[PDB]
Symmetry: C5
């Protein structure tokens, strides 16, 4: 079958709707998430119009093969969605109500700049390509856009699931394409990061600062270098697969700063020891005493600057 | 074919049953589990009623294509179940007995608050969407709900497999849906955690407390900082993929406490050394002697408080 | 088509056979193994009997669709097997010889009590569900049961592949089920564990015992705590995914004992140092000298007890 | 159906086009990348020609089964692409315009010599095998070659997507094959490597050089050997799966050099200590003082030589 | 359809050919490799012979369903190959030329005895099972055996791709089977192992031997035990999944020897210290001085013996 013809020159409007049943496997490294939802479609095909009195039915049911169905696809999917047609209903005016249940792996880029205190807008792009006889345009039926109350994403809070009503109409390979943007707003559950990652990592760093209350070079070397090993080992233990970004991130800057702090602490320990050995204990003592304040103060200040720059 | 019509205006009742053959791959991180089971369905279709005398059989067998079959789906599945129709039997009154064997990956959230001494209620939600001609409602045939004696879940004890008899009837996409809750109760086999994880982790922590019987700062630094490395390395060795939770867990609190204990032990070692160097050995000696009791006592007390708070 | 009718009351016998072509991916953690084999089936259908003289043929070939075929399934599989029908031959008496080549992931529990010196009996359960018209019973063609000479399981020695001749006949959901047990006996290739894992792990433990020939507390702390780190790091290097068991295992008991030994060695080192510092060198010296014998002797004795208890 | 016959003996030209919708999962270790794109095909089949006046239509739509379609395959794919036919349009002269949306895992070798400052040319080879009745030749319609503006590859900058216009025509197994080369030029986003990997790794190496400002052998041993452990642990933390190459790489040479530097630093520390013990402090002091300059200078020089040799 | 009958009693010869298009994913641990190739088949079916004069065409094209095709399978595959029939051509005499493009995961055992300086012969076993009416025998058409010039296996050098011309004919499940051995010879690219793995591992071992130029027990303990940790950590960093073998390997022997060397070095360090403490410095000094030569010499000798035994 071919598409329904226009009465005048008007394009065919396909009313869309996505209703989330399940959301899962939000992969930060791959920048993908899996979705199980309903895809509702609606359009008018006058060739299917009927008189309810003659037919003895108020609604007609069709198999997908029997009638013309617009070819709707997702832009940002890995493989084509796995769909099962649930219902096809035709009303006396020829209004077709199509419903399918689908599952898909969606490719949606994430902004890691504010990780792990980040919020993300996940996108599901619906698209239709126009045909020779007429232009096909997508629309949103807001009453058919939603999500199940039980929908959850492990490690995230689901804020909302909405659609941008105005489609993006553009030309592609000498034909019009009508694209809709469905948006799933999520915010990361940062709570666990505080006791699990940030506080133990700070404790390990604070241990290295005890070298400023000791004049024993052998003990100080062990303190700073062994805590550096503990820091690295701790990071191996708690790491999650974040991808490499062309921009600087909040976490990226802090972690670099922590390495810089271990390095400067070694410098201090090296300088204090050298001055003592080179018969200058007064200088060595004043550098160590200043470090007791300088290290926590510079650390607190730099963190405030970074927090301000990123938030 | 279309659904059987009602005699009066009553909805069609579909008697369901799930019988577990195999259960496997309970993934704590993904919050999924795989199941291999029988799905039994039963309903009345008068169009299929026959007289057993002028036909010649007592029961009639049909191929799925030949008769109308309700479209039953699972809510909390990743992809649609892989099903193989085993039998379709029709009795003289038109009672259809349907049986299929299926395999599915089920998405069911887990509560980690009491891990590894936790119990879980796994859910398998059965659903039917109503049609134009009539409403479809789900029911439970308790004689057809069960599990094979050999059913096992590695690392878990299977308590029971039951169904909540009353379905959840609600509207979705302008039609009625009838949902059943099948519940698989499981409790974690915690035994192995005691010799494999808890006892060695405590031994490593106890090693750090030996620093309270030594006045050697160099030896004490090695004791506390090297045991901290051993603790982290041990945790890398025995770790399992638990997901990030928006709530505090029993294990999460204990592990945080262990890090806090390594930190306070460094403080003590630092304080004891500083007082000795600053010609105050009496204070240093009384702090170390108190720590010998304070550290195991506070550790034992905090654990009792946490165990009480979580259980 | 429906099943062949009985002459008298007798059930239909389906003669089975499994011939192993490939065995692979024995996953200790998942307790699964993959198999590529032939499934041979044989039964008599009198409706298919023919006169070889009139027909001009001694054997007839059929497509699966053309004739009735019993629905055979595997109990302990993850997903239904991937099968390709190879041959269907009918002899003049109506004896049907069916042959398919299949691949399947089999779920079979393993006993880790004696790991890595363990032997396992892998099971492949064949099943048939009876129909309305007649009962279907499974039988074994011990000649049609075997394995290819090239069949190998990496890390294992294949002992035998057989079937328990007597099927398990039982009722399930108001129908009879006939179940056959096919057994694949395997024994673990433990050789590599000796140079790769056991000997280096013992060397690391023996290094800690050198602390009993040293009175230097700083050196002894480094010896025992650094070897504990080496032990953990070594275990990270050589680890394989064994699942958590509700029972104690040979390896589990030994590994726990090794941690206990590192702990007691720290106690000894702590006690020896404390007595020296508290002006009691005679006691400290006799404890260290006794430890030189006590530690290897208790270790050798405990291992003999454990080896006796588990073997 | 069979291919359209030639008027004279001329080959059938199949006009091709690939338009990138999504690009993802560039796996450095596997040397693969996944692509979601449009494959446009065009050829003339005179058997499909029609009169638009009689037909009452200007364009005819066909299902793939209804007409002959050239068997186009990709050379360097893992499995055959998963394709969904979007449109098949036939114009009155018999010109067929075919369009499908496909997803494929492409195998394309990478040059790691300049990693992580490398650029790559990814290839997608289109191929057609000629048939008995006539020869099939591929062509490029440059108007139908492109990529979506939103196309991104995590960790890479997409430079261009083009096709080499001249196909490679050659014989293979007694038939002609027409092959087209589609090229996707990419350059690695190296920015993150500087704060995340190179700078912390240099800091760890610089820490070992502090041993040249210390005469304490015990402290120097800890400095050089513990930093070597920190370096290895750091490399475990930040590693990505690069495959084994038969050639030397820039990163491979630098990392080898870093190990060599830790080794030479141990030699220096060993030599300095030995000379002091063997009553030669003047030699020991001049070796250590020279090392303070020699180690950073040789390191800076060798890096310049390597950077010159590789870039 | 059934197989072509013999003129006299002769078996049916099926001329085979495999042409490699792509080779990838050589998994050392699973002992598998993936292949994308052409499978060419040729046999005579007189029922398909035609008269070129009275028929019109020179060659006839058939769909797989229309004619009898021998059931060819691969022995050592995980799952059945993914095949797409490319061409089926019948010449006037009834000679059928079949061509398909397939992808398969092949299970082929590897010999690790000489790893990483090993060579492997990968096998692809083609098989045909004989039918009731006649025996089917496989043959090799050498003109249809080969590989694409661009065929590569990451980390390996492809030597050749050939077939053993004489098939292996044997009985299996009361029928004849004809098996062909296709061999892909490869040799491992060992180059990268020298700078990446062997040289840094030797440097770490050489560091431990510096303990023979030091009488400081505390420094020597740190040297030998910390280098042992560095060795283990380095091995974690550079490890690749080699499976457990029932035989001793070159790499296995060397790695065991390295652990033994760390153990003997601890013994020496322990003995040297004990003799000094027990007022025997002459013995301690001569043991350390001998060790300076004994350790590198025994290491060099043992390696020569092992290299000779394995190569």
């Amino acid at each position: 079958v071919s598409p329904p013809p226009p009465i005048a020159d008007e394009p065919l409007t396909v009313n869309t709707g996505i209703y989330l049943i399940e959301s899962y496997s939000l992969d930060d490294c791959a920048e993908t998430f899996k979705v199980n939802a309903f895809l509702s479609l609606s359009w008018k095909d006058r060739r299917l119009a009927f008189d309810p009195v003659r037919s003895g039915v108020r609604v007609k049911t069709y198999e997908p093969e029997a009638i013309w169905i617009p070819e709707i696809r997702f832009v940002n999917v890995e493989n084509a969605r796995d769909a099962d047609v649930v219902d096809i209903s035709v009303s006396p005016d020829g209004t077709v109500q199509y419903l399918e249940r689908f599952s898909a792996r969606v490719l949606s880029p994430l902004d890691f700049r504010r990780y792990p205190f980040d919020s993300q807008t996940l996108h599901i792009y619906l698209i239709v390509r126009s045909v020779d006889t007429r232009n096909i345009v997508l629309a949103v039926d807001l009453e058919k856009v939603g999500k199940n109350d039980d929908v959850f994403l492990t490690g995230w809070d689901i804020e909302s699931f909405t659609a941008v009503v105005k489609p993006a109409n553009f030309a592609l390979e000498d034909r019009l394409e009508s694209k809709l943007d469905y948006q799933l707003r999520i915010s990361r559950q940062y709570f666990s990061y505080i006791p699990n990652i940030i506080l133990p990592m700070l404790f390990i760093l604070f241990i290295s600062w005890t070298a400023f209350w000791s004049t024993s070079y052998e003990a100080n070397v062990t303190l700073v270098v062994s805590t550096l090993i503990a820091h690295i080992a701790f990071n191996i233990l708690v790491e999650t697969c974040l991808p490499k970004t062309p921009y600087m991130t909040y976490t990226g800057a802090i972690i670099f700063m922590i390495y810089l702090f271990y390095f400067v602490a070694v410098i201090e320990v090296t300088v204090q020891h050298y001055l003592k050995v080179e018969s200058q204990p007064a200088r060595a003592a004043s550098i160590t005493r200043a470090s007791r304040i300088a290290f926590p103060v510079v650390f607190l200040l730099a963190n405030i600057i970074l927090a301000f720059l990123f938030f």
